[PDB]
Amino acid sequence: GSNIELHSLYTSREPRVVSALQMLKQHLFKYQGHIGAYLIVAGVDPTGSHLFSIHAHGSTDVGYYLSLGSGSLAAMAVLESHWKQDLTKEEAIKLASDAIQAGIWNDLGSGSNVDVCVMEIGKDAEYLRNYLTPNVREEKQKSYKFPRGTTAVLKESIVNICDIQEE
Amino acid sequence: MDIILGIRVQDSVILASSKAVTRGISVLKDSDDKTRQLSPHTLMSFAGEAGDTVQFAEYIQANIQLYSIREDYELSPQAVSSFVRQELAKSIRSRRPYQVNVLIGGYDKKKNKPELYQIDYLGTKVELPYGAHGYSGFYTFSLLDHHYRPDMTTEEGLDLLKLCVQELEKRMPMDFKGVIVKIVDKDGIRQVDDF
């Protein structure tokens, strides 16, 4: 991302997904899989909209729908069942979050919330942090707030965080 | 080597170190001094892998002596211990690490206080009232936890040290051929020739 920004400034052009893809794969390949990064790279640029996957050893794949991680099989099952050509934005978000939910529920390595990011052509990318929150913890039966003075203390002291003082 | 002990009393630090040098199935020497004087008021005992122990000790000694000449000044025990720790902490991630554990007993002439530092080969430093390396602590810390009081006199420290050595001679399997005892105080370093 740093090198892409510098490259964008050098070329006076908006960065391309294939540039990030190429820079990532060559870096990962060089480290022979020891950098355990498995990525799904997506974005829009002057060339159009793109979607790629990257594995730790440096291999890349193209597709209309992709999934990675321990819950990728649960997700891919949903994608293979419901994906179609010419999806709308609203349909794609739904399909994407449903694929993540499949992982959340059925995969122990996955859980909690669903994060989404939509990159549409000719628009600002919208990052939807905690798009879904289907795992809020229920209220506890009891409050475990202690009575003050419950813990036994030996010593107390003020810590000097300030600098050396004047006068 | 085997057993190295340290105890910091009121006005001095006492280091006890075994005399045996066993190389396999034979006790080669029974009068080995496992210590080096780093500066007039700083003593370092050591134990670990053969060769590495002396090589490390003399390397540290040389560095501190070089500092003393350059600045015409003796480093504090705390400063020397920090220098030693850094060398070992550097060493542990080397091609071939120094396999050496040390105790640094010094008398700080500025603060007028004895100071005992225990540092292992990983570069793990701790300031203690009494310390040990290897299996020595397993026997001796219970006695020290019991009979030690911080206002002890050097003579009381030596008596408590005798109690430690007696327990070691009773329960340890290896014959370490007694110990050489050295005292570090305001007047410098001296050896107790009868122990």
Partner: protein, 240 residues
């Protein structure tokens, strides 16, 4: 790297850079070394152009290389620190490997070797420093006094001076120093060293530094008052 040959021969067979380094020594404050029967004394000039100086912290002219050897110098002050540092490192290295402190001759040979190396190495200029190295060999009561110079030559001296107006004080020492009977005591040796500096120094106040080295690592620097007593006694005998 910068490889330029700065020290080179001239048509008349001179290495001007080495010779110009001697001119830097000629400019430096006077230093003198006198060895007695059981001691060596190193005298050093302090130019009184610099007052408001803090004499506690200002780098002293005589430097301990080890507990038994000392080094004074004339010439570039910054250059002298590099030689002193190298010498101190070599002194500890010698103790570490040989298990015995350096002889005064060995330490001199090392410092002289460093100075020589800088006269035929690329990209470096010679040291603008001559040194006086004095002390006592381990377990030996014979006094030692050596001199070095930018070219790298070194030699032993019964008494010697270097720096500005060293020609004058060498003149004094040559007529006043007797080899058959050197200064038998510390007093006589210090007195002769102070006398020799008084030929050149100006005022005998804070312009003279004296350092006495005795056998078995017994090195002490005299104070202002102690030196001032020598200065007083010398001139009172002179008024006759």
């Amino acid at each position: 790297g910068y490889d330029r040959a700065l020290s080179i021969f001239s048509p008349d067979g001179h290495i001007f850079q080495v010779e110009y380094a001697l001119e830097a020594v000629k400019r430096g404050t006077c230093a003198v070394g006198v060895k007695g029967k059981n001691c060596v004394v190193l005298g050093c000039e302090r130019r009184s152009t610099l007052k408001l100086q803090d004499t506690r912290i200002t780098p002293s002219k005589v430097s301990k290389i080890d507990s038994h050897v000392v080094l004074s110098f004339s010439g570039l002050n910054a250059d002298s620190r590099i030689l002193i540092e190298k010498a101190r490192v070599e002194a500890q290295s010698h103790r570490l490997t040989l298990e015995d402190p350096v002889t005064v001759e060995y330490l001199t040979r090392y410092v002289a070797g460093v100075q020589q190396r800088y006269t035929q190495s690329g990209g470096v200029r010679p040291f603008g420093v001559s040194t006086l190295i004095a002390g006592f060999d381990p377990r030996d009561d014979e006094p030692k006094l050596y001199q070095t110079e930018p070219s790298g030559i070194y030699s032993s001296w019964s008494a010697q001076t270097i720096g500005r107006n060293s020609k004058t004080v060498r003149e004094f020492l040559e007529k006043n120093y007797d080899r058959k009977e050197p200064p038998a005591t510390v007093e006589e040796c210090v007195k002769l060293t102070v006398r020799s500096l008084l030929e050149v120094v100006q005022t005998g106040a804070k312009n003279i530094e004296i350092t006495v080295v005795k056998p078995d690592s017994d090195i002490v620097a005299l104070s202002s008052e102690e030196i001032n007593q020598y200065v007083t006694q010398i001139e009172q005998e002179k008024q006759e």
